[PDB]
Design a protein around this ligand. Structure first.
Ligand SMILES: Nc1ncnc2c1ncn2[C@@H]1O[C@H](CSCC[C@H](N)C(=O)O)[C@@H](O)[C@H]1O
Ligand SMILES: Nc1ncnc2c1ncn2[C@@H]1O[C@H](CSCC[C@H](N)C(=O)O)[C@@H](O)[C@H]1O
Ligand SMILES: Nc1ncnc2c1ncn2[C@@H]1O[C@H](CSCC[C@H](N)C(=O)O)[C@@H](O)[C@H]1O
Ligand SMILES: Nc1ncnc2c1ncn2[C@@H]1O[C@H](CSCC[C@H](N)C(=O)O)[C@@H](O)[C@H]1O
Lengths: 275, 264, 271, 263
């Protein structure tokens, strides 16, 4: 942290503040974090677990250039689309990411560094993936969390962060297999779970809808605290505002894999203040 | 400057080649004119009436960046949307124009002149009009042909052409009212025809009658018998002219390009 | 001391006669047409700015009318292309009677010219019969000598130098590639005879024109050139391919009618 | 004063009513050319007139070279064959009469007298009556034989003969009523026969049709004028049914005496 400043981030579709969490877990000094989220449950998680440092705004469709020019400047712009295709409904929110990203980019004649990233699910009509790549002038890299977690989570990542397209290597602290994410006296029938959506149908193996955990000879679904270890979140990250299996699995099912995002944000320690 | 060159233009959704027609009438040298059009009847009009000077390609969807670097460079990129909204069906062809326009833009910092234009009708959702303004980073200038032609054709013009908000004035040769565009022994009830896509406008021999194809051509400012090509009857001639630009509106927009490219 | 020509054209069609007299420079003082096609009437009414006095079905033209509209210096007619004494063929007799009513009274030296066209494809007895009525033998004139299309037609009449052999002019477009628009190659040099039905374009059934490697039928503006009509002569009253090919298929070859009317500059005013 | 015999071409001559009327009229006939194809009809005028009538053939085979050879002619006459109408079938044989008539007319400006006549039935389409008048440049005069014979025979007569509209008067020798035409012991129920369902004649209180000799007196022909070439009841009535009425023609031809030689 020499002659550099704290980072100034604009996270759209921020969810449960995965981005702010990683910048802190890396030790990057976070000067400003602007989140555009509508889920009042998701908003509760970042407001509490990060002690109101995140400046929450509102629906991304009501953000204007005048706002981007005032809240800014931004060093980082990140967005993860909501998991009808592109030009219909929720998918066409990407264009709201497109415009705010362009409004945030440095003006002609400002060589200052500017990084961005946009995640989207791998399950996507190839006409759409080809289209986003045309808008962003950039081709995605597929990063599967299986290499760094105990879950299949294939996602496409556009952007320009240093060493994105670098291949993924695990760390010694990553709970690599399901038995490492489980609580006491729980035996994982498998090693890697299938992809996890918001619905409970994603917790049982695809072929016969079989439970992945066996406690006391009887099969059981995963607990909420065990989902948090699978996605790399801190334990009890989502124990907020009286949420049950319903919400907790919704907020996590939509989320990023934290060890994946840390793989992308790790080189940002080079360009901004750290402590 | 003074050492100018002929103009290199890519025209998407070209139709009946109003852009090339307005250019040669303006007196500007055209070195290349690349057109993207899929209507064989429309293709035939610009192919015949301009002696193959127009390079046709195909469906704009099949144009890649390699094509733009082969056929380029370009000084002018012009496009007119096909009149469900923007994000569905034929409205979303605009994004194809959006990418090919950005592909064709000069290299960053290249001081060469480069101008573009995009047209769309006013009968458009305000949500789509704003979104196009957000994509192009530009606000439309509305120009109605009523001031220069005998037609109601209000349209939005996105672009960076010199002086687009310039006031629209008529020429000495602009056929302003309907009676100036009619064939022999025909009298016009009206003086400015409403839009073309329930009283008849023309009375001949005391019997009401619709306009003729040759009369539609004079209304939009096209040369007479401009659409008499490829056995097209009243049907095709009307839909081609119905979807087409008004010539004096375009000549108004393209006029200041003479001070940037060659002439004669 | 000559005066403008006064002509009565029966079965007038698209006013080929008026168009040719004009292109010759003969001053026309009165042109009385008998035509029923509302499309054809529109073509001569517009292209000649209403100088042609249209009347109607020839069967309602009476002697009292010929004496009112007259005198006539030229009386021309082309038959509708079942034989003579049946159907539309026997309209020739309506031409026969109006011609004789238009003739100068016994004791009038004034010049009087007439003409009657009919198709070569005709019963051998019907050709003898018309020639018996008109006291005149026909001369076969084929547009193929002056145009790019076979058009064999018989011409009864008494115009100066009809039976003269046909020779081409410097501006006649004799081969098909002279009548085509841009980027079109003619597989042929001379088209077979053209009729109203669309099958006249396919050569007994090859398309005559090739564009972009794909063969195509003739366009309308190319038919106008093949017959010698001015281009866009039939682009009138929202007519599509249906009417244009119908009117031109029945039409006269303009370079042929010019051949016959050219010596009439000697007998009437010209400017 | 210095007149000559009459040179006549009769088309569709039938049983030669023209040559009969001319000699009965007292007019000197120098040449009579007839176009007829019925061999029985041909036989009547050949025998009843001792070959003075020059028969040629079907009118359709008569060319202008013939009309110049056999001519000149002073009289051209023709009766139409009596329905498809004019422009179909036997109606259009009129046009063959048309051209041969105009072939025979004098050179344009020649003052010599030339007379023609065309006959057709009143049972005619008005459109064909109008067309024939347009061709001939002439309007027909209707003459019914009822005024001079004992029959209904109304026919149109196109032509240029002197006084064709002249009022029809009967002569002292015209057999006017049916009883005057009948053989012995036969009584006529009627006074005038309709054109050629009760019987007209009653012989010995029994009904009976007319005899061939009685038909010959009805049309004004000489008695036994058709007793030629083994002709039975059928043929004689056919020829007489299609014939002219002799007194009607004599009416038309009477004024020719003041133009040609009479003896
Ligand atoms: N119209 C809108 N404006 C702003 N945010 C929206 C939105 N519609 C959906 N969102 C939010 O976008 C988020 C996308 S899910 C992904 C969020 C992030 N990757 C995470 O780790 O949680 C959801 O939480 C949803 O609430
Ligand atoms: N998918 C596609 N690719 C290329 N061109 C298309 C297209 N779909 C429609 N078009 C063409 O785009 C035109 C839009 S109408 C506008 C034509 C033009 N403004 C003029 O002055 O004539 C239509 O003629 C249509 O044929
Ligand atoms: N009964 C009638 N009275 C008047 N004209 C008629 C008619 N019947 C047919 N016609 C016309 O006669 C024409 C014969 S076609 C010949 C027209 C002329 N030769 C030309 O160059 O166009 C047709 O146009 C037809 O409309
Ligand atoms: N093709 C033809 N050429 C010459 N004569 C013909 C003919 N066809 C029919 N005819 C004749 O025309 C005649 C019509 S009957 C009229 C004959 C006359 N009126 C009389 O007094 O007898 C018939 O005798 C018939 O034989």
């Amino acid at each position: 942290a020499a002659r550099r400043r704290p980072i100034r981030v604009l996270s759209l579709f921020d969810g449960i503040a995965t981005g702010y969490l990683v910048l802190k877990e890396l030790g990057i000094k976070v000067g400003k974090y602007v989140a555009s989220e509508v889920c009042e449950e998701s908003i509760a998680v970042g407001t509490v677990k990060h002690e109101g440092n995140i400046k929450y705004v509102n629906d991304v469709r009501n953000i204007t250039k005048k706002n981007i020019e005032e809240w800014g400047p931004f060093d980082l712009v990140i967005g993860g689309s909501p998991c009808k295709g592109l030009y219909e409904g929720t998918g066409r929110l990407f264009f709201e990411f497109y415009h705010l990203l362009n409004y945030s980019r440095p003006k002609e004649g400002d060589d200052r560094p500017f990084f961005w990233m946009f995640e989207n699910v791998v399950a996507m009509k190839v006409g759409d993936k080809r289209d986003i790549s045309r808008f962003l002038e950039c081709n995605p890299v597929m990063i599967d969390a299986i290499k760094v977690s105990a879950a299949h989570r294939a996602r496409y990542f556009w952007g320009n962060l240093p060493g994105m397209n670098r291949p993924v290597i695990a760390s010694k602290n990553d709970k690599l297999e399901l038995q490492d994410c489980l609580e006491y006296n729980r035996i994982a029938k498998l090693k890697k779970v299938q992809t996890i959506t918001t619905k409970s149908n994603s917790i049982k193996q695809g072929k016969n809808q079989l439970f992945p955990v066996v406690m006391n000879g009887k099969e059981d679904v995963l607990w909420c605290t065990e989902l948090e270890r699978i996605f790399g979140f801190p334990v009890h990250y989502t124990d907020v505002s009286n949420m049950g299996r319903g919400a907790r699995q919704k907020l996590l099912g939509r989320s990023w894999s934290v060890p994946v995002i840390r793989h992308l944000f790790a080189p940002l320690k080079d360009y901004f203040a750290c402590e």
